[PDB]
Every structure is written in structure tokens, then in C-alpha cells.
Amino acid sequence: DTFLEHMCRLDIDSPPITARNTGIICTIGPASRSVETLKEMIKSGMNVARLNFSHGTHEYHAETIKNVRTATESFASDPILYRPVAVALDTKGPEIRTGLIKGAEVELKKGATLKITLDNAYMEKCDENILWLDYKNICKVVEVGSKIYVDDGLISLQVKQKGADFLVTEVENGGSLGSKKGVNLPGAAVDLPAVSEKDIQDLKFGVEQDVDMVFASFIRKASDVHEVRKVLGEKGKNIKIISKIENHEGVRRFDEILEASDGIMVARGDLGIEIPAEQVFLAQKMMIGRCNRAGKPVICATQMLESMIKKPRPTRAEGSDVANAVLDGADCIMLSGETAKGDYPLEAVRMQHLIAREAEAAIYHLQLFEELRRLAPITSDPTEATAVGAVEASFKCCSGAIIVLTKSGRSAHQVARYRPRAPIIAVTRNPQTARQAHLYRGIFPVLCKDPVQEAWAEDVDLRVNFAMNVGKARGFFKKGDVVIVLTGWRPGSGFTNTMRVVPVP
Amino acid sequence: TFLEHMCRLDIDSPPITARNTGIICTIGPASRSVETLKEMIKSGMNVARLNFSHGTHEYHAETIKNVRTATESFASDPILYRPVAVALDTKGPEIRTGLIKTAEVELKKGATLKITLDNAYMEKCDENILWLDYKNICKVVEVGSKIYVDDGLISLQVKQKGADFLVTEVENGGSLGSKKGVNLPGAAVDLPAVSEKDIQDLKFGVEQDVDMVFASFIRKASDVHEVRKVLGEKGKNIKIISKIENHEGVRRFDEILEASDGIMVARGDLGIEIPAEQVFLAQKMMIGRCNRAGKPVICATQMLESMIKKPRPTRAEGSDVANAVLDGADCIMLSGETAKGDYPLEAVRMQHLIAREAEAAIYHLQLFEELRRLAPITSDPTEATAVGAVEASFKCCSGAIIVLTKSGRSAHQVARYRPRAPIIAVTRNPQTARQAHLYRGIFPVLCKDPVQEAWAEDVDLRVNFAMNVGKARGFFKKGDVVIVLTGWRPGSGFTNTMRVVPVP
Amino acid sequence: DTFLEHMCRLDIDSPPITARNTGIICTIGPASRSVETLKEMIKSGMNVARLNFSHGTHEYHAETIKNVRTATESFASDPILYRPVAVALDTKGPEIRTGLIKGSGTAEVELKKGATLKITLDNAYMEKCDENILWLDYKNICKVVEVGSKIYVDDGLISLQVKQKGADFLVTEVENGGSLGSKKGVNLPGAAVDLPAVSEKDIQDLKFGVEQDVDMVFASFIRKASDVHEVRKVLGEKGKNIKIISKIENHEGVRRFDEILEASDGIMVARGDLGIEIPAEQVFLAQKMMIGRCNRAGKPVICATQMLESMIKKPRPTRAEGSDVANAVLDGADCIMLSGETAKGDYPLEAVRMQHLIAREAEAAIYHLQLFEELRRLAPITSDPTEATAVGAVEASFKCCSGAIIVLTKSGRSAHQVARYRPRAPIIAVTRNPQTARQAHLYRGIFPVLCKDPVQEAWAEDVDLRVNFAMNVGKARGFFKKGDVVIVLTGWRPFTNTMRVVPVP
């Protein structure tokens, strides 16, 4: 009855429900792009496949998309067990990079001197003495004493001298320098565009390949989102834009970015360098909160199970990080190198599945529902009122599921905002809405392919019966259990205005 | 916060039309005429209480006839027609005097008054000797016991005991009349819960088709069972409201509530049996537990007492009605105010006025949160639909919650969660329409149209009826948002469907 | 847990503490102005004596004051058991009254609905009022009242409406009939009254109050802050320590309550006239509102009028009256008041005792932990060590279930700040200032005790004297016994900055 007493009552031997609510996004790479491995990842729990356009050609990514769709459609024979898989495009954005090593990695030692050059005669001759990068205007946005970080901020350089096309720096924090490492300038205002010419081509390619969502990198303000929106244009209007917050400016101007975006990713990787590492959790919990309040999907990302790249078991800190991300209210959790290049992609997915499910059984649901309700504005919207009514009814009868018949996903999205314990089975005939539904916590999208019935009454019963079988087959509920059913009152409607409390036949 | 809620209470902010709390009116010489009854219904009367502590069956049969005559005078228009319930108040185990010589003798402090059981003095009462009808009083009373007469106004202390008499000293003098009620706060009264007279009155109630029985002096669960048994099969649908008016009733309250259909906080006798200082504690306790259980609770007795003789109530009385509603009482009651008073109409209107202002002051969202949180998790589809509807109503500021119901069950389940929006209960059952007044916020509406073959057409007919009712009575306008609770498909006997729908 | 669950927990067989916290204010009149009766009323529980200057001469009230002080000082021989009694001056103010009945015939006449009633200003009819013609003392009534407006007579029981208009007369039609007596109060809710808040008579009364050394003033018909300032100015420098309690008896007073409360030392909810100026069904709204804001501001609030009306004629109160007193205490009123019940009723002693019993039971029904949580929540952050000590003591009293909170004060400031947060334990305020001892009754929970011992030279020794005095008081008054725990508040050297938690010796 209090947060304190709630923690005191948390017990290990209380099994979670079988349904796992928070989405799992997996970065696809060499370790996981084969059709067979992709099949295993789907039944391991992968909901969204992220394609990182920071690397690889369009031919490479087109091939990955095909393999993802091949693996996904191999389960399409049984619509009851079929799990939709979303495809996400992660833009390169204004990245700053090395720089090919001379060719053995070079050792940077503390106190030593290192020069940065823009002369393209050194772009493949990087060593202990000289360094190249692809930022043309780095010598007009940086002053003496500035901090320069390379390779995930594991190496830091302090500028001593400045020139027309070079920089003399001292090795503050030193380590082994590799080729093509990420460069960060935490204090500098960056001249690089939000949507470059390459970004435009990649975004247009995403529309061509019918991707479900776009992860826009290094979004600093609302105008950056608007540019990405305009590039997608009319043809890609239904493609959701998830803004990645990875700079100080992004956190600072989060409100205007969230409003413009369809969702948010907490990009803790770059954010942990642009911003002091010990401030990251503040940024995470803040953004997750405002997203939960706004009812827009939020993704927690990067290094959640980092050590699982080499180990079949995560660390205790990693197990904690995933659980806490869920407890904070994250709609999706993400895996990068763990699934892209690691030695245990399948293990990393299964682990996130296990932890997330255990975490959502620890959610102080009734307090959370109260807080989310006092922030909910009063409107004349029948879907909004029905969603709230459905969630509270699900708490009242300890529902096995909340069945939502939706065309666009809106009714299912608004149910998810109030965080029910029971899984939300969203029945749809729209393949895209089924895939995009994975962005919201608790939504278990199921795809109906039966022809639409003239008599609307039995067209509803057809879809409801389908959701019943899905719940039974996937072990959410059984005969004699109670479920909530949401549907419109007549076809062609843009609203769900009817709630049902029905026993499972 | 509740404090800040109090600080923001505004006398100028107009209240929502439609008053939710039921008004129960005791019918007597001042209000039993058809003419007066019509005005009382129009003033806001929802239930008519007939007190069988006085009067004959012939007298009450005529009163019931007058109530239904006045009630059915508005029956020509089912849209504006307001159902009126009939309540039978049992005599119960009452201890009474004692016919005087019908004048009044004066009792003075310090004087000696002799209580006798000799029936030779049952019609010869005066300031010297006093007769009463409790044959075992000398066995349950001791020397030093305090004896109260006439609503606890006259107090006597026992000085000596006889086999059939008591010698007492008047400790609180006053004017003594005939047939006055006697209370023995310290004594263990052994009178039967249901007497032979009660049996004949209860059987009479069944014949007269009364909607509810106010069982007097209920001490325990078995007392309720006796009343239930007497009503039997023929009266199994009659609601039993247990009146709590003694210490044992408060002590064994939980089991009484479980065995009953509802509760009356009978402050009159209760304020005599226990210290008057404690009545508000018992009242707030009982209303709280009744709200929690979802069972009707009535606050009664002396709420506008001064209005028996004056056209305006006192400041304590105005406060009393308001706080009763704020406590969470489903119904408010008038006794002498409407039974024998000089301003019965003014009393009804005043309660209506105060009640409506009071529910506007209710912290609706906090009250709902507590009721939502205390709600028991069950597999019942109707209960889930009910609380879901109330949630929806707050979310969309619903004009009303329309409920189709046969037994009233679904309508009652909505009421227990205390929505701000009025509950329009559409039924074809006239009895459930009458019994619906026991629950706050339920505006019962009686559909007279025959049952259609097409089930969806039958539902639409009843729903469109409620829509017309709400518009006519000014609950909502065309284009407003209302909640509609019905069944989903024919056969099943539960309300499991909620629709959020615009007013045509 | 919740308020509802707290209601269900209320137990009638659960005895309250011996101490009764809310003050009882008794109006003194013919039924109670004798020395013999006044002694019994003090024993019954009277804390403040109200002298209604709406009636009586200066000689009359002086004798009443003399009688009050005689009865009070009859207990002075034992300073342990001595209970200070305050003297309040209730001003007449802008009252409008009739008008003596003709004398020929009966005392009261019968005004019948629909009949014509002429109101006159001609002093020839000053003592010849009847069914046909009625005199009142408002000389400007014809110039302010409008045709169609309504006039209320005798506690609003009688209502008339103006039909015609003359120079020194008004022709009215009886709307609500009834029995009309002599010198009855008259209300003009829908009119702009010329009468000043402080008339020439009020000034003489106020100055007379300073002369008689009254403790506080109940200013009648206060409409705005400027009225409070006029009262403050009349009391002047000699009466600057006299508390000004503003009585809210009209719509304007309710409307402009905030500026009034700020300028005042306290507030009376004058439901009598207020229940005539505004609709009677709105009174509880104004009552709970004013009490709430007074509790928030930490200023004393009095609920008054008709709390136990029936006890004027009967030895027992009605059920509505028992409820009214209990709810006023639960609302948060510092003081409850009796008028005709003690002034001229048949059972003034029984009425005082009843208010004592009900108030004590009501205090044991207070949900203290919720109330204390809210009073802190709305408490401004200082920047004042006295505030911090008061709060600490109150919560400390909760933690050890303290028998009392002992406060050494001179102005009363310390004790007031403690009562502001509403502890359950009684507050024993030890002082040598007799006036502050009397004024202390305006605050809930403060039991003022007057120390008669001479000021001991050593400040530390002076403290131990006054503290041990409070111990003996608590013992004798039955608040706590040997072995219990109490809280002590003192200063370090001659504001309150010191707190102690000590076992009762």
C-alpha cells in the first residue's frame, strides 16, 4: 500500500505470468543475419530487427531485410502462432570517425603528443603520432583546452594548439587506438547537418524497402525531426520516427523533440560521452517518464547485456539494468553488439526475455495506474474513455488478456499507455500496424487474413475467436478465464467505443 | 489534497442538476392525502415510510392506496414518471406506556414515580403511578438503573424493586404523555426480535406489495433471519433494511450487514441506548462499511427536526444533512417533519436542496480512488463492467451512465463506485424500479413497451428511452457523451457490455 | 490507510483521551451571569465568555465582566488546577431591528401570506408595531432598497417583498408569514446597506472594551479588510494586544474572505446571519471553506450559532445537533460556540457539558496522520527556527505517543505554531502573562497554565521551575502519569529553539 511496503513484499518464489510485455529490439549483423539464426531469434523473442546504416551498402541491407522477412514468413503457415516482426532503419547521422591505421593497433600513452589532421593523405596512415578524421570543420568549432573523445570515449585528447587544418593535442586518457572509431566533441557546437546527403538516400531507401520505423540519430531539436519527416514525405507518412537522444542538447530540448517524434530512443552510448556518465540514469528516467506521460513509445538502449558479447551469462549489473529499465517504464529494450557480432546472440535475447518478464511482475501496477490517470486529460474521445475503462476492468477481474480489434492500432496504443498487467492482444488486418505495434509495451500483435464479413457482427466474432485461440495456444489464459474485448460499433469507424467482459469459451 | 479541496469550496458555483441521494418521507396526518402526496413527489420524495409502531392495517392500507394514487397520476408520461417506493417500518420489541387518565401530567425532579405492571393501571397513568407493557422489566433492571421515557427526555432512577413494580426517583422532569417509548440502556432486554404483531404486520406487507421492510431493533444476524423467514417465498424479493438503534446492533454490526439488504442508522433510539456523544462515531462507521460492501445505508431521525414547527431549519440541521451526504449515505430520511409537521413540503425541498449542494462538494476522484482500490477481485463480468463504466465516466465527463437491468443488480454495482454522472436505470420490472431509490445516483426509469423479438431492437428501444429521459430532465443535451451498459447477446444473465455513445 | 478505511475503523467503545482540545465559547446572559452559575460553567468546561453588546448597557456588561472574573479567581488558590477564562466583546455593528409590538393585545401578531404590511420610519410607531404597520431603526432603508427586493424578519423566518416606495415608508407584501415579536433582526440580502461596520456606538463599545481589559473582540458584519483596520485603529495603541476576530455573516464577507483573514487575528463562522444572507443550503460550504483556509493560515477559527438550539428548552440535544458539533471539530474548528443555550436557556450547564463530551469524542476520531501530512505539505519553507522546532515536537509526540507537549511561552507564539499542526497530545502552555493565558483558548489543543511564581534570576533555573509546574498540572489534570513521555519546548537564552523528550518524573 506504499512504495516501501511494496518492495518489502516482493518475493522470488512468485512466478511471473507467461506473457512478456516489453518489446525486444535486436541489432542484426554478421552473427545474426542468416535465415536460420533469424528464425531462432524470433522464437527466442525478437520483436524488432534494427538495421544500422552507419555501416554497409544498400545491397547489403536489402539482403538483410529479405532474410528477416524470409525467417518471419516461415511461421506464416499458422496465423495463430505467427509473430509479426518489425524492420527498423537506424540512420548514420552526423557521425565523426577515424581514420584507417597505418598497417597492429597503435598504443596511446598518457602525457604523449598526438596531432589531428584533415589532410586526406593520412586517412589510411593513422598512428601514434598523427590522426585523421572526416569532419571538415573541426578546426573552427574547437578551441584550446577542449576535450576530444575517440572509441566510445575510452580515449580522451586535450587540445593544445589550433590551426587552419590541424590540431595538436595531448593524450589525457590513453589506450589502444583502432581504425574507424567514433569521435565525440562534448563541449563543441557541431556544424554537421542532422540529415546529410547520405541520410536522405538511406531514408528514401527505407521507404523503398517498406521499413516500419526509422531511428533518427543525433536529433538535437524539433527541426531535425521535421527534416526527417519531410524526407520520408507522402509515401513514407506512416513510417514511425523514433528520435535518438544522444547529446546534451537533445536531453535539454527533449520536450519539443518528443512532440515532433512518434517515439524516443534513449541512446545511452553516445549520451554517456556527450554527458558525464553518472548523469545518464537521470536522463533515462526523465525521458522514460515524459514518454509514459505523453503515451509515446520509449526505447532503452546500449550495453544492457554488454558482457554477453563474449560470455553466455550476463553480469549482475547487466541483469539489474534491464530490470530497472522495465521498472522505469520502457516500452522496448535493445541489444546491439550482443546480437550483431557477439558470440551468444540467442542467449542475449532469451536473457532479456526472462528479465523483462520478471521485472513487469514487480511493477506496482495500481500506483502506476493512479499516476497515469491523474495526468490523463478529459476528452470526449470514445476510444480514450474505453481504453481506461478496459484497463481498470482488467484489474477488477484479473483479466487473462485485453483483446483489441483495431485497424490503425490507436485503441491498442491507448490501452498500453495505462500499463495493464494482462497482455494486449491486438487483432488487425493491417500488416504494418501489426509490425509497428511492437513499439508499445504489452501489445501482442496478431495478424488476421480472413476475408471481411458483410455482417459486421460475425466479422467481430471471427476476429475475437481468433484472439481466443491465440491466447490459449500461447498460454495466456484458458477455459473459464475472463478477458476484455474492445471493438467498434459499426465498420468504417475510426473509433473503438465498445467494451466487453467475456468468459473464455 | 483534501484540505485544499475544502479551501476551494465555492458557495457561488451552481450544482449539477439531478440530486442523487434518496429522500425517504414518513407519511402521517400531515401528508397522507392524495393532494399533498403529489406535491411531495414533485418536491422530491422517493420513498414513503409507513410506521407500524402506530396505526391499524386499515389505516395503512388507505395510506398506501393514496401513495399509489398520487404516484400513478404521473404515469401517463413514462419519460417524466418518477417511481415511488413503499417502506414498512416494523414496531419491533418496543417498550411503551401507558394511557394517562388524553392529557399530560407533569413530572418534577426529585419526586417519586411508581412503575407498575398491573394492567388495572394501564389506562390510569399519572405523576404517581406509571404503567408499561414490558412484563420482564423487574428482572432485567436493578436498583440504580436509569430509565428513559419519551425519546430520552424524561429520566428516572430505580430506587427499589418489587415483583411487579419499580419505585423510581425522577431525575429529569418534564411533561409526560400517553403511549410513550421507554428505553433501558443498561438492561439486557429479552423481548422477541419478531413478535406476533410483527409477524402479522410483515405478512400484511407482502399482501400490500411493499418494496422494503425497515426492521426495528435488529441486534444480530439471526434477527434478520427471522424477519426473512416470515416474509418467506412470496416476499423473497422484498429488501430488508436493518435498523441499528442499540449497542448490540453496533457491536454485532458486521454480521447484521452480511445478513441484510441494507442498513438504517436509527439515531433516535441509538442516541438513547448509547451516549449521544457517540452517535456520530456509529453513523460514520456504519456508512463507511456499507459503502465498502456496496449495500444501501440510510441516515435517519431528527435531521430537520425544527421544521416540524418552523418553515426554516437550524444551522445544525442544515449541516447535518450535508455531512450525512458527505459521509456517503445513500438515503436521507424525514420523520415528524413530514408525518405531523406544519411544513412537510418545505422539509422535503430543503433536503433536496442541501443534498444536491453536498454531492457537488464531494471529492469525487478521491472517493472513487478509494472505492476502486478497495474493490474485491472477482470473476464477475457485471462487476468489472460496472467499475469500468465509472472509470470511463470520469475520463470523458459522461452526462450519465445508462444501465439496462432486470433485477437492478448491474445498476447497483455501478452505484457502489459512486460516479459523478447520474445513473439512468431502465427496467420493465416495476418493483426493481421502486427499490432502486435505495442506492445513491440511481434514477429508475420504467419502460412500458412490450418485449421485441429482435433483441438488438429491444435494447435500442430501451436505450433511446433513457436518452429521452436524460434530455427531458436536463441531465444532458443532444451530442453529449454518455455511457451505455447492456448485455452483449441474448441468453446470458449479466451486463457485460459498455458503449461510449453520443446523444442523438 | 485511506479515509474510508479509517471511517470503518471508528469504534464507539474506544475511550477518548481525558483532555478536550477545542475551546468552548459561551454567551453570557440572564441564565448564566451570576457568580454561582459561572463557577459551574467553568467546571463544565467554559473557556471564553462572550458578551453580546447588541444588548445591554455599559454598566450591565461591566457587572457581568466583574462576575466572570470573580468566579474565575475563585479557583486561583490552586494554580495547578486554575483554568484561565477569556473575555470576548461581541460588537453590535450594522444591525437592523424592529420595533416594539403595540402592547394592546398579545405579544406577537400574525403576519399572513399575501397580506399588506407597511414599513415605517416614523418614530411615532416605534413602539406600536402590528399586523398593518411595522417600524425599524434603519433610517436610510427607503433610499437603498428596491421595488421587488425581499426583506427578511426574525432569523429569516419571515419574508416580505417591497411593492411600493415612499419617503419614510415602504409598502410590502407578506411572502412567508409567521408570528412577529418585538425587536426582531432584519436582513436585506439583495441591497447595498448604508450602515458602517464601525458606528459611533461601536467605537464607544470598543473603547469600553479596552477600559475593561477584554481579551478579544468579535467584530460583527466584517465585509472587507478596511473594516478590520477601522476596528484595529479604534482599539488603538492601548488595545493593540486585543485579538480581533472577524465574523463572516454575509456574501461579501465570504467573497472577500482572504483579505479579511489576513488583516484579522481570527475568524468566526457566523452561520446565523450568514444563513439568511445566502441560501441556507450553502452554509456548510462556506463553513468548511473558511475553516480550511484558517487551518492553512494557522489562524483560529470559530464555528457559531444554533449548534445545540434545542437545549434552550430541553435537557437533551437533537441528533442533528450532536452531529453538527462533532463535524465542526472534524472540519478543523478551533472553537465551538453557544448562544441562547447559555445566555437565556433552561439548561446552560447541560449544554456546556454536551459540547465538552462531543468535542472530545470527535478529537479521537480525527485521522491525525493524514491531517498532519497535509498541513506540512501546504506549509511554507522558512527561514524560521521556531517553525522547525514546533513541527519536530509534533511529530516527536506522534512517535512516542506523548502525554502532552509542554511549551514555555510569553507571547503565545510558540504554542500557536505547535497547535497549527494539530497534535493529538494536549499542549500545556506555561506563561506568566495572564492575557496570553486567556487568549490561548482561541487555539485548538492549547491548555494555558498561569505560573504565579516569581521570575527566578538564573534563566536555566526559571525554566526548570515552569517545566516542573507543567508536569504537576498534567498529573493533577490526568493527562499523564509517572513513567509517561512528554515533549518540552524552551528557548536557549531569554524565540523558541529548544526541544526535549523527557520521561515523566
Add this chain to the structure above:
Amino acid sequence: DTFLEHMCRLDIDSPPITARNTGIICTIGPASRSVETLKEMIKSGMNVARLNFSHGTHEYHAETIKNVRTATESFASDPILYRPVAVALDTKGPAVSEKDIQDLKFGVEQDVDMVFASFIRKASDVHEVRKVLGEKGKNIKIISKIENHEGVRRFDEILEASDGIMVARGDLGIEIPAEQVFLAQKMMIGRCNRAGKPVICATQMLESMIKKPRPTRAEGSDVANAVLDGADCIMLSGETAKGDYPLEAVRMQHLIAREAEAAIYHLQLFEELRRLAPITSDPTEATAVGAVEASFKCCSGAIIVLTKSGRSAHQVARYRPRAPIIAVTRNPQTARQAHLYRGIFPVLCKDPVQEAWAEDVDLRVNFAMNVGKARGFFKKGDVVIVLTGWRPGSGFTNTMRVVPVP
């Protein structure tokens, strides 16, 4: 207002301006056991030094302790700045092995402040450890390590019999499913906060910092959430024992911990703790919560507490004030043990006892006034809460004073 709204209001650019309340326990090993290193680790923010007795001999561990105390007493020429440092013995693990019995008696001779008893399955095991310590080390604060399923189930009797608890997530994650560890952690920390007893979150909090100069995002999140859960101390195992960046690991925990307690809803936590506060006749307990209440009421710079046993300082800490708790004391084994409790920044008195007891108290108070003004807690004109005894030689603490800073 609400917790959700509190999250939305969290600010990265709102600088933490207090001290660092939660303790840092560093496992001492080959990468840290030198006097030269230990001085830098104390400066970095180490409050407790852990010695794992699963390895090493009594001779090796004895040499380790002297270096800790040598490094610690190197600052002992300035009591105003002197950071006390406690010593803890972590056993190897039948409640105690024959080796444990010999190692425990060793710790008493070496004058350790704490004992981290391994594999605590029940309260009887805590009794068999308290027994070995005997009257010799009756002031040795026993911290029970919950490492298996039985420890979790029977946690209530263990917590009662113990002076504190360590959440040993390492071996616990092996016994129970790794996804259940966070549940066990939050439960045990919650109950420990309820019972007013120290709780330690340990193992792999900054695991990657053994070989890398900066931690991962998961590790940075783990430390912060540990503090937000309500942990009194966080621990470093291999990060300080055999790691390559032991100094960086300590400075990282100090940094995360400070940002974490600036994120804590300071009002909601206290209201809950105060709501569950047991009703007793204890004057010190009442004074403590009264002081915390007053501290929130005036935004006190600190809460100065004069204690001998540590109890009065502990009782203030159990109700989680935002203001630092400056505990002035003479018993050196109390100032060091004070690190087990969040918020208590201990200060050791070196001044001789005055005859004028009021002047004696006024000296210890002035001592704290100097300390807090120098360590950036409060300045001149600020308001602080002082908790002392009433009349000399009193049984306990019962007096609260609110006084401007000179």
C-alpha cells in the same frame, strides 16, 4: 507531486551540492594494498576496506591492515579534515568452518570494525558468529551476507539477529535464477530501510572497469539504482582488488552515488519511513525523527549529532534526511563504523574533556561547525540542527536545538 511527475522533473544540469551520503566499500588486494595506493583511495572516497578471507594467509591480511591504518592516520594531524576509515573482515565459509573460527578471532586481535559472515542461512548462524566474537569484540558490527535461497526466505530472522545485511548478488545469482536477483535486492534493501539497519549491495557493480577506464551504461545504471533502492553502502570487489583502474572505480561510484541521492524524492521517502515508524517510549528515537522533520522544515545545512555508541546518529539516518549528519564522537571505533549508515559523515574528537560540561558540549558542537563550514556543507548564517544530551552524564540523547551557524 507524484513519483511519475518527479521522474519527469529530473535534471542533468541541476548540480548535486551536498556531500556523498552512501558509503563505498573497497575490496583491498594486490592492486590496492600499498600505503601509497590506499592514501589515494581514501582521497578518492573509500570509507570501508574489505579483506576477503577466502584467500591469503593471516600474515598477508595483517600486513594489509597496517597499510590501511598507515594511510588513514597520514591525515590524522587535522581532525577537521580527517576521514575515518573502517576495516571489515569477509569470511570464507555449519555456520562457521574451523578456518572461520580462527579467522574471526584473528579479526578481534586486529581490531576490525565489521564482519561479513558468508552463507548466512538462518538467525542461528548469526548466533554462532556473535559467539566467536565474544565480549572481546562485542562492538563488532556483524553484516550477514545473503547468498542463497534459504537466506532470502528466512531473511526476517536474519535481519533481526544481525547488525546489517549484504546483498551478495554474486553467489545469489548462481543459486537463484539471475533474473530474480534484482527482486531479492529490492526486497532486502526495503526491509533493511524499514528496520533501520545497514544494507550493502555488492558484486559486479563496475565489473568492466577492471580492464576499462570508464564503465558501461548498465554498470552506471546499476550503481545509481542501488542508491535509489535505498542502499546504505555499495561495494567494489575485483574492481579494486586486482583491477587496472582501482582509483577510477572508486571515483566513479562516488560520482554516481552523489547524483543518485540528488534524484531521490526527499519528501516521499521520509513520509513513508515516518509512517511505518514504531511507537516506543524511547526519547532518542523520538528526537531523531523530530530532528529530521525539523531539517526538512528549514532546509538545514546539516544535522549535528553528539554520540558515543553511534545510536543517536543511526536513528537519524534511518529516516533518511537530505541534510548531512555530522556525528561528533570520541570512541574511534564508532566514527569508523558510522560509514555503514547513509548520510552520516563522521568526525573524530581529539580535544580533551572539559570540566564545564556545557563548554564541553559547546566545544564538540563548535568542532562540527568548523568541519561542515570547511567541507562545503554550510556557511555563515545557515541553519543547522544540534542533537545533544540534556544534563551531563545523561543516559542518552534527547535534546534538539536549532541554531544559526556562527
